[PDB]
Amino acid sequence: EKRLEQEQRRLEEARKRQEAELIKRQELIKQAEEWNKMDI
Amino acid sequence: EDNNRIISRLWRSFRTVKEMAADRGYFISQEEMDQSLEEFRSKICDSMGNPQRKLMSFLANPTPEALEKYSDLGTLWVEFCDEPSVGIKTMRNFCLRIQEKNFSTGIFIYQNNITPSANKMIPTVSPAIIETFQESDLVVNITHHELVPKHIRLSDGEKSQLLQRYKLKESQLPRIQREDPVARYLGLKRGQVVKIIRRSETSGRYASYRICL
Amino acid sequence: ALEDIMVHYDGTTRNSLGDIIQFLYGEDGLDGTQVERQTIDTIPGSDKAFHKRYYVDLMDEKNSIKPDVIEYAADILGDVELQKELNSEYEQLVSDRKFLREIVFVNGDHNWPLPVNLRRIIQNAQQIFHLDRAKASDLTIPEIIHGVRDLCKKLFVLRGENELIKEAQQNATSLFQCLVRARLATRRILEEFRLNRDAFEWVLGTIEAQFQRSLVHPGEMVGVI
Amino acid sequence: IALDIEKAKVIQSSIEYTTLKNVTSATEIYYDPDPTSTVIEEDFDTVEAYFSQSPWLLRLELDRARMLDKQLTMNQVADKISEVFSDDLFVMWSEDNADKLIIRCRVIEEDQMLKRIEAHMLDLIALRGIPGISKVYMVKHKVSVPDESGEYKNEELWALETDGINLAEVMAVPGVDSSRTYSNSFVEILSVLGIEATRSSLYKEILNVIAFDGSYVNYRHMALLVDVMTSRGYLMAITRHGINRADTGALMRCSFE
Amino acid sequence: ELAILKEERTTTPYLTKYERARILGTRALQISMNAPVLVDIEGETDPLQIAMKELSQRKIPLVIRRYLPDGSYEDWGCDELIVD
């Protein structure tokens, strides 16, 4: 059970990191879409 | 029909480019990595199904791990060219776009061929780096081949530690060409060292090093 | 083309210019005359056979070490720290099986030339120490585990405390360590070979010495060979 | 696809190079001044049914047997000719139910020009398949794969072996395992997959040559040889043009050749 | 500068067969040229046999200098190298 708890903690940490990186990524996606619209 | 196969090949090239950008250290969202073919047709193909290469250009920033390991990693701009043949004008305007938006690295994928005059102005785009790939050779990701082991670019500190451990000079390492397909996949610049961890039937695992030219 | 290539004192294989051809001769640093065909026991067989051969359970009585082969069978059942040690050993064995079966030898071939013949060493020990008879062994499980674990760290191909040197040294003996751990498992030692203590230290010392003797000698003109 | 013979045959047909010359049985040139009719009575019915520029008629008869064997369609051949020649030639093709499969063409002193155009047609009209792949064979391969119980059990699978090499194009064909395509010409392997793949392929070829007659040579010797041949980033041939183009001493180099 | 300190010597601690052969040859030649013998000779007369007897007892007064590829070297005494 102790091992399972540690595994769950690490999984939650990884999930938080992925969420933060996705939040950062969406801004770049928006900028890219705006610039591609500008080129058109 | 032939439209379907063209779209499929374009989708495969897009997936390969995204994988290459992920390998070089930039961040690509997991949802974008698994962006399927039907979604690609929905987003790119028009009412007649024709695709726009201009809608596939994207941007990426290095992950904190890659940024920490490699301090020279900037922003990456990847653009597909609508023109089947690229000349001096198109390369010049691509260079202008890179310079005005201060991108560190720009990847320019063309369709058929590139004129020698356009090749001439690639080295003079400093300090930004412009790398060109053909659409045909990006359909298959060579780094997923069985015969191709995993190549990892060494940081400057690791290269120094290697040369000190073996008491070497840079000319005494095994070499890898700059136009080598894996070297162009990793965007290797002259003087950089890749570590290759390889299957061995005498010891199981064997780590080799090569230096670019 | 190959005349001026020679194994140097740091283990590398270089030509007359000093350019590196290989970072370790033969990718393991051994001599061509000091290897023999041996079978790695963790590769073949079904999962059930592997589990039956290598797993040891100290809680279930009928899935434990037989009581007539060990003197201390009374105070073994119910121990939890010793079970932790056995579980670590079995996890190491499973990792070795996965590494050999999915990376190195995908087609499952398990007969490969490797240094120091282990079967010969074991039967020599059995003949030397008269390991016949139904006598019970006095070799405790922690001694087996720690002895094999320490042996797998004294197979020096490269000397030095450098981190990169340590990584290369660990890489150079992966297959051989897999072989040694496959042969000198706890269940196999206690049941199949029935070694006692003195036979066990003799086997460990002999393995280490023979491995040291099987390395390549600096100054070999391996290119001409 | 590996375990199904029908899909494997489909892939084999899709890969093999096939040109118009492969299926063409004979070619002929006729004089016919009426674009809306013809002089030949045999082809009169088909052309008149179709109808319901230069007078020089260029026709050619396709072998029905091989045309069927290559699984081709008369419409496909006509479309290929039209694509390669735009609208410079008016093309009519007989139906599949005709006694002889024929296709007619017309230009929109020209006899020599027509002969040259006919030669070019027989030369470089590509119907389907990867260029450079002359022949393809179906081969059964025995592979040992772990079972659901972990046991290793033999298994038979279908694979293709070709004549001629085009690695980059064949790797891109859908239905092909692009992560395992292999070639016995390591120059192409170097041009496609890099230098480490070239090292592995070179070792495999050398071992194949040595072990064919049952002989055995230790691994480290061939490993040293193929590490020497690929240590400079490119294939260094074991000749004077490979060895003598190094930076070694002049006295050492002059002693060879 | 080029010499490597005794504490940081990283070469093998064993006498390679080439080093053993060269040491035996040099010692045999020196004995044949009337060099002092550092071990007691029972009834032996062959210089090579006397050299082997000296080597077995770790009494050969020679030093091996092992040249690394970069030019640096390690000095090992024949009395501190392990011989099989």
CA distance C202 to D213: 43
Q: Does A31 touch chain B (CB under 8 A)?
A: yes
Q: Which of C159, C212, C219 is facing E16, going by the closest CB pair?
A: C219
Radius of gyration in angstroms for the set of CA atoms belonging to chain B, rounded to a whole number: 19
Among residues C5, C141, E7, the alpha carbon closest in space to that of D231 is found at: C5
**Structure's resolution in angstroms:** 3.4
Residue C110 corresponds to which tokens in the numbers above?
């398990």
SS3 D193: helix
Backbone angles phi, psi at C9, to 5 degrees: -75, -15
CA distance D228 to C6: 12
Q: Are residues B112 and B150 in the same domain?
A: no
Domains of chain E in sequence order: 1-84 (3.90.940.10)
SS3 B153: strand
CA distance B55 to D85: 33
Only one residue has tokens 């397909």, namely B181
CA distance C67 to D203: 52
**Domain range spanning residue B65?**
1-140
> For the purposes of burial, counting CB atoms within 10 Å of the CB of C65, is it exposed (0-12), middle (13-18) or buried (19 or more)?
buried
- Look up residue D176 and give its DSSP letter: S
Residue A3 corresponds to which tokens in the numbers above?
């091992």
CA distance C196 to C129: 9
The contacts of residue B202 (CB under 8 Å, 6+ apart) are: C26, C27, C28, C30, C113, C175, D219, D220, D223
Residue B132 corresponds to which tokens in the numbers above?
């060109």
Q: Distance from B166 to chain E by nearest Cα, in Å?
A: 9
Distances in whole angstroms, Cα of residue C178 to Cα of each of B151, C38, C85, C184, D142 = 25, 12, 18, 10, 28
Print the SS3 string covering B29-57. CHHHHCCCHHHHHHHHCCCCCCCCHHHCC
The alpha helices in chain B, defined as continuous H runs, are: 2-23, 30-33, 37-44, 64-69, 88-100, 116-120, 156-166, 181-186
Q: Are strands D152-163 and D135-146 parallel, antiparallel or unpaired?
A: antiparallel
Residues of B in contact with C104 (CB under 8 A): 199-201, 204-205
CA distance B198 to D159: 27
CATH number of the domain residue B133 falls in: 3.40.1340.10
Q: Are residues B48 and B90 in the same domain?
A: yes
Among residues B213, C6, C15, C18, the alpha carbon closest in space to that of D243 is found at: C15
The contacts of residue D165 (CB under 8 Å, 6+ apart) are: D132, D183, D184, D185, D188
> For the purposes of burial, counting CB atoms within 10 Å of the CB of C73, is it exposed (0-12), middle (13-18) or buried (19 or more)?
middle
CA E29 to chain centre: 13
Per the CB < 8 A criterion, the answer to whether B132 and D174 are in contact is no
**What is the number of domains present in chain B?**
2
Amino acid at D132: G
CA distance D201 to D183: 8
Distances in whole angstroms, Cα of residue C146 to Cα of each of B80, C141, C194, C209, D136 = 60, 9, 18, 18, 58
Residue E2 corresponds to which tokens in the numbers above?
């080029």
Residues of B in contact with D193 (CB under 8 A): 142, 145, 147-148, 181-182
Give the relative orientation of helices B2-23 and B37-44 as an angle to the nearest 10 degrees.
Answer: 110
Q: Does B167 touch chain E (CB under 8 A)?
A: yes
Domain endpoint, select from B140, B168, B188: B140
Given an 8 Å threshold on Cβ–Cβ distance, is D192 in contact with B175? no
The angle formed by the CA atoms of residues D195, D196 and D201, to the nearest 5 degrees, is 95
Q: Are residues B168 and B127 in the same domain?
A: no
Only one residue has tokens 């192409």, namely D188
Q: Are strands B175-176 and B129-134 parallel, antiparallel or unpaired?
A: unpaired
Per the CB < 8 A criterion, the answer to whether C38 and C173 are in contact is no
Residue C16 host element (H or E): none
CA distance D174 to D163: 20
CA distance C31 to C157: 12
**What residues pair up with E82 in beta bridges, in sequence order?**
E14
For the four alpha carbons of C11, C16, C19 and C22, in that order, the dihedral sign comes to negative
Domain endpoint, select from B112, B140, B168: B140
Q: Does C141 touch chain B (CB under 8 A)?
A: no
Q: Are residues B168 and B208 in the same domain?
A: yes
CA C130 to chain centre: 24
Q: Are strands D24-31 and B175-176 parallel, antiparallel or unpaired?
A: unpaired
Residues of E in contact with B168 (CB under 8 A): 70
Q: Does A36 touch chain B (CB under 8 A)?
A: yes
Per the CB < 8 A criterion, the answer to whether C54 and C183 are in contact is no
Other beta carbons within 10 angstroms of residue D78's beta carbon come to 15
The contacts of residue C110 (CB under 8 Å, 6+ apart) are: C39, C40, C41, C43, C44
Per the CB < 8 A criterion, the answer to whether B182 and B148 are in contact is yes
Domain endpoint, select from B107, B140, B173: B140
Instruction: Please give the biggest Cα pair distance in chain D.
Output: 86
Per the CB < 8 A criterion, the answer to whether B81 and B53 are in contact is yes
CATH number of the domain residue D20 falls in: 3.30.1360.140
Among residues B187, B190, B188, B193, the alpha carbon closest in space to that of B160 is found at: B193
Q: Are residues B155 and B186 in the same domain?
A: yes
**Domain range spanning residue D102?**
7-128
**What residues pair up with E3 in beta bridges, in sequence order?**
E73
- Look up residue C104 and give its DSSP letter: I
Residue E43 corresponds to which tokens in the numbers above?
């009834």
**What residues pair up with D91 in beta bridges, in sequence order?**
D105
Per the CB < 8 A criterion, the answer to whether D123 and D21 are in contact is yes
CA distance D142 to D154: 6
Per the CB < 8 A criterion, the answer to whether C77 and C61 are in contact is yes
CA distance B11 to A32: 19
Q: Distance from C18 to chain B by nearest Cα, in Å?
A: 6
Q: Distance from E70 to chain B by nearest Cα, in Å?
A: 7
Q: How many helices (H) and strands (E) does chain C have?
A: 8, 5
Q: Are residues B32 and B124 in the same domain?
A: yes
- Look up residue B143 and give its DSSP letter: G
Q: Are residues B164 and B127 in the same domain?
A: no
Residues of C in contact with B199 (CB under 8 A): 103-104
Q: Are residues B206 and B185 in the same domain?
A: yes
CA distance C117 to C34: 10
CA distance D72 to D226: 46
Residue E24 corresponds to which tokens in the numbers above?
């035996």
Q: Are residues B167 and B87 in the same domain?
A: no
Among residues B76, B56, B55, the alpha carbon closest in space to that of B67 is found at: B76
CA D116 to chain centre: 25
Peptide bond into B174 cis (omega under 30): no
CA distance D136 to D130: 11
- Look up residue D142 and give its DSSP letter: E
Other beta carbons within 10 angstroms of residue D82's beta carbon come to 14
Amino acid at C220: E
Q: Distance from C12 to chain E by nearest Cα, in Å?
A: 9
Exposure of E29 in the CB half-sphere (CA atoms within 13 A):
7
Amino acid at C197: R
Length of chain C counted residue by residue:
225
Other beta carbons within 10 angstroms of residue C218's beta carbon come to 20
Among residues C9, C8, C12, the alpha carbon closest in space to that of C23 is found at: C12
Q: Are residues B8 and B102 in the same domain?
A: yes
Buried b (16+ CB within 10 A) or exposed e, D138-161: eeeeeeeeeeeebebeeeeebebe
The residue of chain B nearest to residue C111, with distances taken between CA atoms, is B201
Backbone angles phi, psi at B188, to 5 degrees: -75, 135
Other beta carbons within 10 angstroms of residue B82's beta carbon come to 12
CATH number of the domain residue B161 falls in: 3.90.940.20
Q: Does A27 touch chain B (CB under 8 A)?
A: no
Among residues C32, C12, B23, the alpha carbon closest in space to that of D220 is found at: C32
Q: Are residues B135 and B148 in the same domain?
A: no
Residue D230 corresponds to which tokens in the numbers above?
């690929």
Residues on chain B bordering chain A, Cβ-to-Cβ distance under 8 angstroms: 27, 29-32, 54-55, 57-61, 63
Per the CB < 8 A criterion, the answer to whether E42 and E62 are in contact is no
Residue B117 corresponds to which tokens in the numbers above?
């005059």
Per the CB < 8 A criterion, the answer to whether C85 and C145 are in contact is yes
Residue C170 corresponds to which tokens in the numbers above?
């660990």
The contacts of residue C194 (CB under 8 Å, 6+ apart) are: C69, C131, C137
Among residues D37, D40, D32, D46, the alpha carbon closest in space to that of D101 is found at: D46
Which experimental method was this entry solved with?
cryo-EM
Question: Which chains touch D (3+ CB pairs under 8 A)?
Answer: B, C
Residue C100 host element (H or E): none
Q: Does B88 touch chain D (CB under 8 A)?
A: no
The contacts of residue D247 (CB under 8 Å, 6+ apart) are: C17
> For the purposes of burial, counting CB atoms within 10 Å of the CB of B11, is it exposed (0-12), middle (13-18) or buried (19 or more)?
buried
Residue D126 host element (H or E): strand D126-128
Only one residue has tokens 């180099």, namely D253
The contacts of residue D189 (CB under 8 Å, 6+ apart) are: B147, D167, D183, D197, D198, D201
Q: Are residues B129 and B147 in the same domain?
A: no
Q: Which of B171, B207, B209 is facing C171, going by the closest CB pair?
A: B207
